[PDB]
Amino acid sequence: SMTRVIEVSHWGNIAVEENVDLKHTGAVLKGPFSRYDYQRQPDSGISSIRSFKTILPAAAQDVYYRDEIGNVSTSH
Amino acid sequence: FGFLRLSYEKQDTLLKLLILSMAAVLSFSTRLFAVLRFESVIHEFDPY
Amino acid sequence: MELEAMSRYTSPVNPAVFPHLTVVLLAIGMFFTAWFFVYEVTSTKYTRDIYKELLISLVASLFMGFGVLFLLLWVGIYV
Amino acid sequence: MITDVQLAIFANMLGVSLFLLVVLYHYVAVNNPKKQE
Amino acid sequence: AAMLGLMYVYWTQLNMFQTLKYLAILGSVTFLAGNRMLAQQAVKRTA
Amino acid sequence: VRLDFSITKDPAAEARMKVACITEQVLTLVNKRIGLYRHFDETVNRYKQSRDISTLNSGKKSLETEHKALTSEIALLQSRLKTEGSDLCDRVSEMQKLDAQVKELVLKSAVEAERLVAGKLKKDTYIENEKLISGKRQELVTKIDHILDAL
Ligand SMILES: *[C@@H]1O[C@H](CO)[C@@H](O[C@@H]2O[C@H](CO)[C@@H](O[C@@H]3O[C@H](CO[C@H]4O[C@H](CO[C@H]5O[C@H](CO)[C@@H](O)[C@H](O)[C@@H]5O)[C@@H](O)[C@H](O[C@H]5O[C@H](CO)[C@@H](O)[C@H](O)[C@@H]5O)[C@@H]4O)[C@@H](O)[C@H](O[C@H]4O[C@H](CO)[C@@H](O)[C@H](O)[C@@H]4O[C@H]4O[C@H](CO)[C@@H](O)[C@H](O)[C@@H]4O)[C@@H]3O)[C@H](O)[C@H]2NC(C)=O)[C@H](O)[C@H]1NC(C)=O
């Protein structure tokens, strides 16, 4: 599910916030998840998804990335 | 001589208001260092 | 009545203006507000006039109230 | 938003000024004749 | 007298929030009457 | 601020507040009296430049007409101050006594200017005579200022 909220203000600004719920629908993982193996070997968890890129509007300003429990600093 | 012509009662009250007003501003402002440097989050274990 | 046929709109007050307006309006409001309080505390039953108090209060409220709006926009909390 | 460097300078300036003003208040208070009346 | 009476009504039916809402109005009127009455009594005593 | 829910009044506070209200009123009036001297001094300067006696005469009559009203008002308020038992009532009369000395000194300056324009008084002598009148006038003002603070 995704909820897209668009607010237009007469003071020269429109603010858009999108709430995204994401689920990985690939084959279910079986057995324990080894952090040590995952870091050490490139092949480990090859199906797993690490990151994705979003193409935003050219004029987008003050972009913020956060979660329910606080900010997330990993986005570039 | 502008300050002198004012009554002393005016001078004492004016200084009293200015000193107290500033002190309130400093008390609130000084506590914002964490919120600016880091995200606006609850701190410590007990507050949660 | 389509976007290309019609014109475009922007706020009359440009963004760069906002910092200057907020500072000027608030300072004027503050000066009158201080004057109102000092006059009230110093004044006594026989030394106070309603007409003077109303004029100072009304002027102070007008200047500061507009200044606050510019402050909110400058901060970015658009109404 | 203001950076932490700006906030620190601001805090120091206000505090120094405020303390000096309290010293000035002491000056007028003693200097006051009606206080001794 | 009414304010004291209100205590019993709270005992049977009202809750804390309702009792305060009525009490504030009743107290205000009682206070105004008391202040005017006391000033008159003070003048009589000092005469 | 207007509302007071008081029961028992304090006459001493009420009278003390009343005297202060009168005291500032007296202060304003005396300041106006000093201002009247300032206008009269300006009138003397105008008289010297123009050499027209009529201009000074109108200024003088205005001074003794407005000033006399101020003095009478000051005495009338002083009567109330004396009625309250304020110790200042003698002081305000004392200021008026000094004020009369200033008033005559101002008159002495006016006549000296008239003689200087007429040539009865030499400029070289006039400078010293004006200096003495102004210096004593300033000293009287200095006395008035201290007692005014005493109010
Ligand atoms: C709350 O959360 C929010 C959201 O997370 C926080 O804000 C976010 O903070 C992060 C912190 O890192 C910011 O990250 C910044 O991202 C940009 C974009 O990075 C991508 O593009 C780069 C562009 O590179 C181009 O050119 C090179 C060749 O030169 C090509 O290879 C590229 O393909 C591009 O064409 C690119 O370099 C980046 O690659 C890096 O990362 C990827 C993986 O993501 C690796 O594979 C790469 O090898 C490489 O490591 C990436 O693709 C970066 O440009 C920013 O880098 C600057 O800032 C870094 C510190 O943040 C610093 O380490 C870098 O050296 C660089 O430094 C900049 O500033 C320096 C002065 O201080 C200059 O000296 C220097 O030249 C440069 O200007 C950076 O990583 C997010 O932007 C930011 N997000 C938002 C929305 O604001 C927020 O802080 C949190 N609040 C908290 C915690 O309180």
User: Please, are residues C21 and C70 in contact by the beta-carbon 8 Å criterion?
Assistant: yes
User: Please, are residues C59 and C32 in contact by the beta-carbon 8 Å criterion?
Assistant: yes
Q: Cα separation of F111 and F60, whole Å?
A: 11
Could you tell me the distance, in angstroms and rounded to a whole number, from the CA of residue B41 to the centre of ligand 1?
23
Residue of A nearest to B38 (CA): A71
Structural domain includes residue F130 = yes
- Ligand 1: nearest atom to the Cα of A75: 5
Chains E and C touch (3+ CB pairs under 8 A): no
Structural domain includes residue F73 = yes
User: Please, are residues F140 and F75 in contact by the beta-carbon 8 Å criterion?
Assistant: no
Counting as contact any 3 or more CB pairs under 8 A, the partners of C are A, B, F
Q: Cα separation of A45 and F80, whole Å?
A: 101
Structural domain includes residue F150 = no
User: What amino acid is encoded at D25 in this protein?
Assistant: Y
Determine, for residues B22 and D11 on separate chains, whether the beta-carbon distance falls below 8 Å.
Answer: no
Method in brief = cryo-EM
Q: What is the DSSP string of F48-106?
A: HHH--HHHHHHHHHHHHHHHHHHHHHHHHHHHHHHHTT-THHHHHHHHHHHHHHHHHHH
Structural domain includes residue F145 = no
Interface with B, mutate which of C42, C44, C47 (most B CBs under 10 A): C42
Residue F97 sits in which domain range? 7-138
Is beta strand A2-9 parallel, antiparallel or unpaired with respect to A70-71? unpaired
| Listed residue (A16, B18, D1) closest to C75, CA to CA | D1
Instruction: Quote the strand ranges of chain C, DSSP E.
Output: none
Helices (H) and strands (E) in chain F, counts: 4, 0
> Is residue F103 classed exposed, middle or buried when 0-12, 13-18 and 19+ CB atoms within 10 A define those classes?
buried
Number of structural domains in chain F: 1
- Ligand 1: nearest atom to the Cα of A66: 2
Residue A48 near ligand 1, beta carbon < 6 Å: no
Q: Cα separation of A52 and A48, whole Å?
A: 12
The tokens for E30 are 């009682």
Which residues of chain A neighbour B41 with C-beta distances below 8 Å?
70
Residues 6+ apart with CB under 8 A from F23: F88, F151
Structural domain includes residue F102 = yes
Structural domain includes residue F100 = yes
